[PDB]
Amino acid sequence: DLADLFPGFGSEWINTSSGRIFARVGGDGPPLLLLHGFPQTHVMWHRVAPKLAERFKVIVADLPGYGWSDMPESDEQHTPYTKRAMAKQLIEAMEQLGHVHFALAGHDRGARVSYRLALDSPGRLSKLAVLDILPTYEYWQRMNRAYALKIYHWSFLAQPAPLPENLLGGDPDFYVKAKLASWTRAGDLSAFDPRAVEHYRIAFADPMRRHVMCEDYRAGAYADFEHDKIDVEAGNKIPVPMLALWGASGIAQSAATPLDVWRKWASDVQGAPIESGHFLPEEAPDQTAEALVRFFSAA
Amino acid sequence: DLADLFPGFGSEWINTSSGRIFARVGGDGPPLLLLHGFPQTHVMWHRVAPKLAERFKVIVADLPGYGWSDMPESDEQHTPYTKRAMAKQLIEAMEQLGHVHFALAGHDRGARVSYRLALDSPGRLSKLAVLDILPTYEYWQRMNRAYALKIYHWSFLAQPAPLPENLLGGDPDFYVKAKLASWTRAGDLSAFDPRAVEHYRIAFADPMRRHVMCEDYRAGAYADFEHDKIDVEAGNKIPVPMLALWGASGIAQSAATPLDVWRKWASDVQGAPIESGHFLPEEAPDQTAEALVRFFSA
After folding, report:
1. Which of A87, A96, B57, B185: CA 20 to 30 A from B142?
2. Are the C-beta atoms of residues B163 and B26 closer than 8 Å to each other?
3. So which residues of A are the catalytic ones?
């Protein structure tokens, strides 16, 4: 009995070459794609998407392999779960709806898809917002003792299969709830709608879904890092106007001052901290939504 | 169902103020303490201890909290599982045997005890051998993407309880075997005696033992690091003659070149690579034993 947290939003299964993308679709106006991250699904947007749907055609997609999206089989390079591939697949998905130029906001892994999309295919984006991330390269480049402890899961989940999978399998509920809780400002589940938590827990309960998340992290440790490294060492910058939002108690600001980092990656970036842990649209829905509305509706 | 892998060694429960240390004891001659690491017990020495026992009184001890040694209650700073506390406990154990001046070889966590012992209490040691480690400080200082992925368990096991404990409980047999196999040159369990693997497996099957191991890694992320840091910053060197052995395809090699690193930490160090993964005494027992004998006899 998973709750419908987007009342009045439609549901779309979008075929792509790499599998169907599930999305909730609501609103009208310029298209805005919202991408969640780990260990969540598209429902993390349920508190901000209605506000967004007042001004935008809001497409709230499950990432490839997450939620109700199909799970492409991975390979030794974790290709389908690299952000490059996810971006390409979501470009396909949006093209299926006739959106070849759209606004994009991503959180967490979804934000990594988003800035990778902006780097690979900037012509697809009108504007980009990334929530509580720095590029994957920067996390790895800032991987000292303190940060290795803080985001241990970057290296734990990237261990070769089936090591993370086997450990996660014993008590999946514990781990998904732990990560949800530990990255909030409060350190518990209070920020989350209980119905949303149930979506996250149910997705996490599927061993294939967990495997996909590890593949995501494996891509994050390897190919994603390599792709970022190429761009940063080539001085490739995102040319799409972008908003970097991060939680004052979130992960991004632990590594570095987020705006300074993003100004290295992006030629036109504005940013704002939000008093929030990592889960900006759930911990700080009003502030997050206002920031996104302000940013995306600015001409 | 545990094999005795040290025929002719005695079995000693050594009382200390923090709990008992289990030891197999064999041989005669100068005392030589052998300290295992993670995720093993003293039985990892089962192939090299007999050769050492030809010339030394070999004491093959389970680290505090590991194997059959008692598990002192930890605290919010993981104090009893800091290498400084383990070293103090092992020193007390050795004093119970009347050994106040002994040779010491450690592997993995046991080697971290050992060089910490050497820094804190160098008068206790005639000679030190460390097997396939760099100082804990060095691992954390060289922390980068490559190392974070390779020794992910340094940050994973150091997560606050009960996160690692809970995950480790998801498949402990898998986890201990995976650690054993993945750090060998072969990549599988073939370098190990199956009866030793069984010792490692049964110790790891105990949640309280696994908790101890997480306490050891939490110590290694916090106080052990801080203790090392003081020594580095003060330029404290190990004055004990020491041997650093490392596996050609081991942990210590990766991030740094082990002899050069240890030379920053010790005034009198020699070293040699052993054609081995991490588990030198089991993957390469003849070479390891030879090297130890030669160093400890000299």
Report:
1. B185
2. no
3. 108, 278
